[PDB]
Amino acid sequence: PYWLYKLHGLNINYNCEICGNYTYRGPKAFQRHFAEWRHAHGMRCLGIPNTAHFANVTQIEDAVSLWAKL
Amino acid sequence: AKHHPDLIFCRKQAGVAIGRLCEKCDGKCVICDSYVRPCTLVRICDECNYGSYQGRCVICGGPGVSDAYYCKECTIQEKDRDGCPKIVNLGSSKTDLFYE
Amino acid sequence: EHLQSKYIGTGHADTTKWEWLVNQHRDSYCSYMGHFDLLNYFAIAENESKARVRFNLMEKMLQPCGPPA
Amino acid sequence: ERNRPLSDEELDAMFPEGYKVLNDQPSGNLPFLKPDDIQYFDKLLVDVDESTLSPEEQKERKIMKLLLKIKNGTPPMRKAALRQITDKAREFGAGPLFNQILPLLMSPTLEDQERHLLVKVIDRILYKLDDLVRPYVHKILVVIEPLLIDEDYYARVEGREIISNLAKAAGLATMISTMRPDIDNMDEYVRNTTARAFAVVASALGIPSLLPFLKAVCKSKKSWQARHTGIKIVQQIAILMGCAILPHLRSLVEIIEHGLVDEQQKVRTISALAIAALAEAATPYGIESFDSVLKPLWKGIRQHRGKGLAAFLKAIGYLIPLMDAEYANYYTREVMLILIREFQSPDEEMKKIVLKVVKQCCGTDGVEANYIKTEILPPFFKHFWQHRMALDRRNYRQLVDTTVELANKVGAAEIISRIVDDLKDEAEQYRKMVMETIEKIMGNLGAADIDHKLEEQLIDGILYAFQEQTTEDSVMLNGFGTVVNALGKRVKPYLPQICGTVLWRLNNKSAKVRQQAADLISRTAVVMKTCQEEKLMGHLGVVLYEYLGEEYPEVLGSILGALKAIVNVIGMHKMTPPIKDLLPRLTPILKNRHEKVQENCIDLVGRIADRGAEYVSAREWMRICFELLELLKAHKKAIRRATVNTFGYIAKAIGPHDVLATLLNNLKVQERQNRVCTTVAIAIVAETCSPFTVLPALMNEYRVPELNVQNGVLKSLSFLFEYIGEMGKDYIYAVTPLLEDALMDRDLVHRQTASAVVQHMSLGVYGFGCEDSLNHLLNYVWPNVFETSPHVIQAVMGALEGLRVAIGPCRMLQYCLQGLFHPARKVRDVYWKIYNSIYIGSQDALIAHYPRIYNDDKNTYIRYELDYIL
Amino acid sequence: KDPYFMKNHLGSYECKLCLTLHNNEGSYLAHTQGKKHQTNLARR
Amino acid sequence: RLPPEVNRILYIRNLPYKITAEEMYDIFGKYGPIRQIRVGNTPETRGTAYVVYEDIFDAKNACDHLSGFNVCNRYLVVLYYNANRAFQKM
RNA sequence: GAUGUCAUACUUAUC
RNA sequence: CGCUUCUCGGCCAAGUGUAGUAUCUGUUCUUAUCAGUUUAAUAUCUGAU
C-alpha cells in the first residue's frame, strides 16, 4: 500500500555512514536499528563502546570526536 | 459556568456588593457549579450591580433569592481571589429555546 | 493573548529563555523584597543595611539579566 | 404546518392495531424549499456536474447549500452545517460568505427563527474571520442595525453581542470610517440605529477611544442632524454603561454643555436627555461635574414650556439627588409649583416625566409631609390615578414606584385610605396595580399605621380582588400573603371569613379557581400558627387530604403545596391527616407526568422521609425507592435534585443495603440525565451514612463488563469524594488501584472520570499527608494531557490544578519541566498553559522550585543572591 | 461461527482480524460484509 | 412559540378499563375541540388511549393540563405522540 | 493515516 | 332499610432543544526532479519543471 508507506514515513532514503554507508527506508526504522546488533558491530570496529551518547551519531568522524571527548 | 464553554465572566475589580442567586440556581457555585460545602461568599463588581442590576442572579440573570457563595474546592484553589464571577454575555444558552 | 496582558510573567508557546529568565529574576527579587527572612539573610551576608539592600534590589529590577537578544 | 387539517387516512395510518374508535426538490435529500425562497437557492435545483465548469463560486454554491440546510433543515443537519461552516470559514473566505448571507437576511418574507439562526451563524463566523471583514463592515452593520431596536430582548442582546464582536474584530478606525457617512443621513431611524451602533462600539472599545471623534462630531456646526445624532449616541452610551462612564463624566459633560443653546429645539431636547442619562448614572454624585449645566437648564424650565421643559424637568429631577442637601432643598422648593402646574398636562410623555420626577423630588429631607399631603398628594391622586395609566406597563410601574415613594415619604396609612377604594373596581389591571401597590406598602412600611377602621376594608378589598380574578397572575396571592404577614395577630377576626370563602372556592365548575384557593391557603398557612389557630389548620388539612382527587393537575400540585405548607407550619407527628394515612396516599401520586406536581410530591416524600421515617413498616420505602428511579430524566432541574436527597434519607432510615442495589441496577439504562442522577444519589447515600459500607459495592460495579456502569461508578466515586472532602483520607488507598486501572483504559471518558476523581481526592485530602498516592496518580494523569477532546483536556487541567495545590507546586514544576522549550508546538502550547496555570495558582512558590540556569555570554541568569551562604 | 468477533471488557464488540470496534450488536453483523473485512479475509 | 415535541395527538397510559366514552370525551374536551379519540380494546393495549385534537395549541394545553391527571387506574400521564415509540411493538 | 456523506455510542448535576 | 351467619378481595410509550467527542460503513494519491510557505521531522499546498 502507498498510503501506509506515506503515512508511516516509509520509502524515504536515509544514509548511515557508520555501517558502511547503508540505506534505511524509515526514520523510526533507523532509530530502531541504531540500538541493534548491526550498529553495535559497526561501532565495535572503531573502538567506541555501545552507550546512549552515540545513539544519534551517524558519521565516523563525529563519533570518534565524541569518544575522544569523554 | 463549566457546562457552557462559551460563557465568559466579568473579571473586573471586586467591590463590596455581595452576589445574589435565584431560586433555580440556589446553592450552586459560581465557577465549579457545585452544591456541597460553601466556604466563601461571592463579591460582585460595581458595574455588574448598579441600578436595576442590584440583587440579580450572577449565573442566570433573574431576580435573586439567596446569597451567592463559592464552594470549598474554589477557596483552597485560590479561585475566589480572581475578578467578578458575573456572567455578562449569554451565547448559545437559553436563547434558542425561547424562540423554539 | 489576554492572559499574558492581564497577568505578567505567564508566558506563551513562543516565549524565549531570556524573557522567562527575566520574569523569574523579577519574581525572585519580589520574593526577596517581600519576605523579611530573605532580606535579613541578604543583610547579614553583606555589611549593608535593609534599606540599602532594598534600594539595590529595587534598582536591579530594570533588566536584571541584561540587554535582550 | 403543524396546525394543518389532516384526513382520516393519515390519522388512521399513525395509529397501531388494537384500538377502537369512540424538478422541485434540489439534488436529493435537501430540505423543502419555500416558494418565496427560490431566489437565493436558485443554483441548487440544477445539478452541479463539476467537470471543466467549476470556478471559485462552486464553493459558494456549497456554502449556500449548507446555509439552506441550516435554515430549514433538520437540527442535526443544521448542527452539521454549522460545524462545516465554522471549521471552514477561513478557507471559504468572508467575501462570498457575506455576499450569500446579506441578501438572505434582508428578505421581506423571513421569520424569527431563521433570523436568529442567521445571527448565530454571523456570530460563529466572526471569530475565524478576524481582521478580514473590514470591507464588509457596513454590509453587516446595515443588517445588524434594526436588530437593536427590535421588540424582543433576546434579539436585541444578540445584535448587541454581534456589534461588540464586530467592534472587537474590525478595530476602532474601520468602524469610525464606516459610521461617518451614516450620521448625516436623511432617515431618522437609520441615524438612531447608527448612533446606537456607535454607542455599542464605544462601550465595547472604550470611551476615550471614541471620545475625540464624538467631540469633533458634536462641536461641528454644519447641520442640526449631526449634533442630534451625536447627542443621541452620547445618551445611548450613558444609558448602556451604568458605572463605566464615571471617570469619563467630565469629558462628556463638557461636550454636552455646548448643546441646549441652539435654535433647534430637538437638539436641546436631545442634550437635556443626554444630561439626564449622565445624571442617571451619577444619580448620587453628578453635581461635581454639572455646575456648568444647572444654569441654562433651569431657565429652560422658566422661559419656555412644552417637551423641552419636560426634558429639563426630568434632567433636574435626575440631578437633584446627586447634589448637596441645601441645593436639593433649593431645587425642590422652586420645582414643586412647576410639577403641580404640569399635573393637568394632556400629553402622556410629559405626565410620565412628571411621575418619574415626583419620585425623586421627595426622597430626602427638605420636603415636609404636611405640605406633600396637602398640595402634592390630592392632585397626584386626582390627575394620575386613572384607568388609562394601568394599560401601559411603563405607565403602571412608574406610577406604582411613585406611589411607593409617596407612601414611604408621607405615610402608609394616608396612601392606604386613598387606594383601598379602588380594590373593588370593575377593571382587572387597575385592581392588580392597586394590589401590587398595597403589597409594596405593606412590605416596605408595614401595617402598623393602619388602624381598625381600615384593616377590615382592606381585607374585604383583597378578598374581592382575589375572588374576582380572571387571569393566572400570582400578584393577588402574593399581595394577600404580604397583607397576612404584615397583619400578624390583627387577622384573628378574619379566619372564619377567609377560610369559609376558601372551601367555598374549593367546589366550583372552573379548574383555576380551586388552584387559586389552594395557593391562597398555602400563602396564608404561616399566619395561622402565630395566631394560636390550630383547630382551623387541622380542619384544613383533613379537607385537603380528600382534595387530592381533583382532575386538574394544576390544582393538585397547588393542593400538594398547601399540604406541604401545612406540614411545615405544624408538627410532623401532630397532624390530623397523619403520616400513617398520607405516605401510602402519596405513593400513586408520585407517578404523575407533570413537572410541578411531581416536584411537590418528591418534596413531600423527602420531608416525610426526613422528619417522619418512623411512620412506615420499612417495606413501602423500598417500593418507593424503585419509583424514585423514574422521578429523574425530567426537564425541570428541581425534582432530580430532591430525589437524590429523598434516596439519601431512605438509605439513612432503612439502611444503606437495599437502596444501593437499586441504584447500581439502574446504572445501565444508556440514557442521558438518568445515570448521573443515580450516581449523585449513590454519593449522597454514601455521604449521609457511613461511606465504607458503600466502599466494596462501588468497587463491585467496576467488575461488570460494561462501559456505562463503570463510568457511572467512577462518577459516583468522584461525587462521593467531592461531597466527603476531608473524610477521604481513609478511602484513598481503596480507590487508588481503581483509579490506577481506570486511567489505563482505551476509553477517554473513563480517563476523564478518573482524572475528575483524582482532582476530587487531591482537593479533599490536601494538607493530610497523602502526597504519595497523588504522585502515583499524577504519573498516569500526565500522558492524558495530550488528548484532543476538550472535555478530557478540561478534566486533565482540573486534575493538574487540583494536584498542584495538594502535592505542591514544586512537583508540578518538575513535571512541567523540559516541555516549555520542546520542539513540537502542540506539546509546547500545553506545557506553556500548564506553566501559566501553575504560576497563577502559586507564583511565590515557584521561586524556590526554579531550576538552576547557567549564565550565557552576554546575559547572566544565575541567581547570586540565593547561592550565597553565611 | 465467526472466529474474529470477540467481547471486550466494556460491553462492546471487537473484530480481531481487521482490529475494529463496534458499540452495538447491529454494527458487528454489518461489519462482516464490506471492503475491509473481505480484504482481511482474503489476505489471511 | 412551541417546542417541536408537541403534536395534535397525545397518548395516555394507565387508563381505567371501566371508563366510558362520555367521561373520556368530557375529560378531553375541557381544553378545546377534540377531533378523535381511540381507546385500546386489546390485552396488550389495555390502559392506553390516543386523543387527537383539532388545534395544536389546544392539544399543547391538554398535554400541559392532563399529565398525571386523577384517574381510577392511576395517574393519567399524558405524553406526546411519537411515531417511533408507538410502533415499538412491531 | 487523512478527507468528505451516513449511522451508532459517549461526556459536561446543561435546559 | 336494619340485625345475624357463610364466602371472596385490598391496606397497615419518560419526551424535546444546545455544546463537545469515539467507532464502522460508501471512497481517493507508484508523478521522475528543482525553488518556496509550512511541519519537531513527515505529510500537504504553490509554482516551475
Alpha-carbon Rg for chain F in angstroms: 12
* Helix, strand, or coil (residue F10): strand
Tally of domains within chain D = 1
Kindly determine whether the C-beta of residue D593 is less than 7 Å away from any atom of nucleic acid strand H.
yes
Which of chain F's residues have a Cβ under 8 Å away from the Cβ of D550?
A: 70
Q: Which domain holds residue D202?
A: 29-851
**Nearest-5° angle of CA D766, CA D767, CA D769?**
100
- Strand-pairing partners, residue F39, are D20, F49
In chain B, what is the straight-line distance between the N-terminal and C-terminal CA atoms, in Å?
23
Which of chain B's residues have a Cβ under 8 Å away from the Cβ of F3?
A: 100
Tell me the C-alpha to C-alpha distance, in Å, between residue D745 and each of D311, D711, F32: 71, 11, 57
Q: How far apart are CA D283 and CA D249, in angstroms?
A: 12
Contacts of D129 (CB under 8 A, 6+ apart): D89, D90, D94, D97, D169
Which of chain B's residues have a Cβ under 8 Å away from the Cβ of F2?
A: 100
The answer to whether residues D646 and D602 touch, using CB atoms and an 8 Å cutoff, is yes
Q: Cell triple for residue D704?
A: 461488570
Using a 10 angstrom Cβ sphere, with 0-12 exposed, 13-18 middle and 19 or more buried, the burial of residue C11 is: buried
Looking at residue D172, its amino acid is L
The β-bridge relationship of strands B69-71 and B66-67 is unpaired
Instruction: Match 406633600 to its residue by C-alpha cell.
Output: D372
Nearest residue to B22 via CA among B30, B10, B13: B30
Tell me the C-alpha to C-alpha distance, in Å, between residue D674 and each of D214, D632, D680, D698, F81: 57, 6, 10, 18, 22
Interface contact C13-D832, CB threshold 8 A: yes
Chain F, nearest residue to B98 by Cα: F1
Q: Cell triple for residue F24?
A: 373520556
* Helix, strand, or coil (residue D619): coil
Kindly determine whether the C-beta of residue A12 is less than 7 Å away from any atom of nucleic acid strand H.
yes
Interface contact D549-F70, CB threshold 8 A: yes
Q: Cell triple for residue D251?
A: 469629558
DSSP character for D48?
-
Half-sphere exposure of D186 (CA within 13 A, CB side): 0
Is A in contact with C (3 or more beta carbon pairs below 8 Å)? no
Nearest residue to D641 via CA among B3, B36, B20: B36
* Helix, strand, or coil (residue D757): helix
* Helix, strand, or coil (residue D377): helix
Which of chain F's residues have a Cβ under 8 Å away from the Cβ of D18?
A: 40-42, 44-45
Nearest residue to D820 via CA among B6, F59, F64, C15: C15
Tell me the C-alpha to C-alpha distance, in Å, between residue D634 and each of D9, D101, D551, D640, D828: 34, 38, 22, 7, 44
Burial code of D836-853, b = ≥16 C-beta within 10 A, e = fewer?
bbbbbbbbebbbebbeeb
Q: How far apart are CA D227 and CA D217, in angstroms?
A: 7
Contacts of F19 (CB under 8 A, 6+ apart): F39, F71, F72
Nucleotides, chain H, CB distance < 7 Å: 11-30, 39-44
The answer to whether residues B11 and B31 touch, using CB atoms and an 8 Å cutoff, is no
Q: Report CA dihedral (D573, D574, D577, D581) to the nearest 10 degrees.
A: 30
Nearest C-alpha of chain B: how many angstroms from D725?
A: 9
Interface contact D154-B34, CB threshold 8 A: no
Number of H helices, E strands in chain D: 45, 1
D14 touches chain C (CB under 8 A): no
Chain D, nearest residue to E12 by Cα: D706
**Partner residue opposite C11 with nearest CB, options D835, D847, D850:** D835
Q: How far apart are CA D767 and CA D769, in angstroms?
A: 6
Nearest C-alpha of chain D: how many angstroms from F67?
A: 5
DSSP per position, D143-179: HHTTTTTSS-HHHHHHHHHHHHHHHHHHTTHHHHHHS
Q: How far apart are CA D283 and CA D302, in angstroms?
A: 23
**Nearest-5° angle of CA D434, CA D440, CA D446?**
115
Q: How far apart are CA B29 and CA B41, in angstroms?
A: 10
Alpha-carbon Rg for chain B in angstroms: 13
Q: How far apart are CA D659 and CA D688, in angstroms?
A: 13
Nearest residue to D832 via CA among C18, B76, C16, C68: C16
Residue C6 CB neighbours (<10 A): 11
Which stretches of D445-552 are DSSP H helices?
A: 452-467, 475-487, 495-503, 512-523, 526-529, 535-545
The answer to whether residues D556 and D550 touch, using CB atoms and an 8 Å cutoff, is yes
Nearest C-alpha of chain D: how many angstroms from E12?
A: 8
Nearest residue to D602 via CA among D575, D617, D580, D624: D624
Using a 10 angstrom Cβ sphere, with 0-12 exposed, 13-18 middle and 19 or more buried, the burial of residue D93 is: middle
Chain F, nearest residue to D3 by Cα: F56
CA of D487, C1' of H8: distance in angstroms: 58
In chain C, what is the straight-line distance between the N-terminal and C-terminal CA atoms, in Å?
22
Contacts of D759 (CB under 8 A, 6+ apart): D718, D795, D798, D799, D801, D802, D803
* Helix, strand, or coil (residue A51): coil
- Using CA of residue D46, residue D47, residue D49, residue D55, what is the dihedral sign? positive
Instruction: Match 378578598 to its residue by C-alpha cell.
Output: D463
Right CATH for F3-82 from 3.40.50.620, 1.50.10.20, 3.30.70.330, 3.40.50.720: 3.30.70.330
Kindly determine whether the C-beta of residue D710 is less than 7 Å away from any atom of nucleic acid strand H.
no
Interface contact F3-B100, CB threshold 8 A: yes
Nearest residue to F89 via CA among D16, D21, D669: D16
Burial code of D587-617, b = ≥16 C-beta within 10 A, e = fewer?
ebbbbbbbbbbbbbbbbbbbbbbbbbbebbe
Chain D, nearest residue to B91 by Cα: D158
Contacts of D14 (CB under 8 A, 6+ apart): F9, F81, F83, F86
CA of D633, C1' of H21: distance in angstroms: 22
Kindly determine whether the C-beta of residue B100 is less than 7 Å away from any atom of nucleic acid strand H.
yes
Is B39 known to sit in a ligand binding site? no
Q: Which of residues 116-135 of D touch B (CB under 8 A)?
A: 116, 120, 123
- Optimal mutation site among B36, B45, B46, interface D, most CBs of chain D within 10 A: B36
**Partner residue opposite D805 with nearest CB, options B2, B24, B77:** B77
Interface contact D706-E7, CB threshold 8 A: no
Chains in touch with A (3+ beta-carbon pairs under 8 Å) read none
Burial code of A25-45, b = ≥16 C-beta within 10 A, e = fewer?
ebeeebeebbeeeebeebbee
Nearest C-alpha of chain F: how many angstroms from B94?
A: 14
Which of chain F's residues have a Cβ under 8 Å away from the Cβ of D554?
A: 65
The answer to whether residues D456 and D413 touch, using CB atoms and an 8 Å cutoff, is no
Is D in contact with F (3 or more beta carbon pairs below 8 Å)? yes
- Using CA of residue D731, residue D736, residue D737, residue D742, what is the dihedral sign? positive
Assess if residue D10 is contained within a domain: no
Contacts of D529 (CB under 8 A, 6+ apart): D537, D569, D570
Residue nearest to nucleotide H17 (CA to C1'): B97
Tell me the C-alpha to C-alpha distance, in Å, between residue D99 and each of D19, D40, D63, D140, D390: 55, 11, 11, 10, 48
Half-sphere exposure of D732 (CA within 13 A, CB side): 27
Which of chain B's residues have a Cβ under 8 Å away from the Cβ of F1?
A: 98-100
Instruction: Using a 7 Å CB cutoff, list residues 56-75 of F near strand H.
Output: none
CA of E8, C1' of H15: distance in angstroms: 33
DSSP per position, D649-688: HHHHHH-TTTHHHHHHHTT----TTTSHHHHHHHHHHHHH
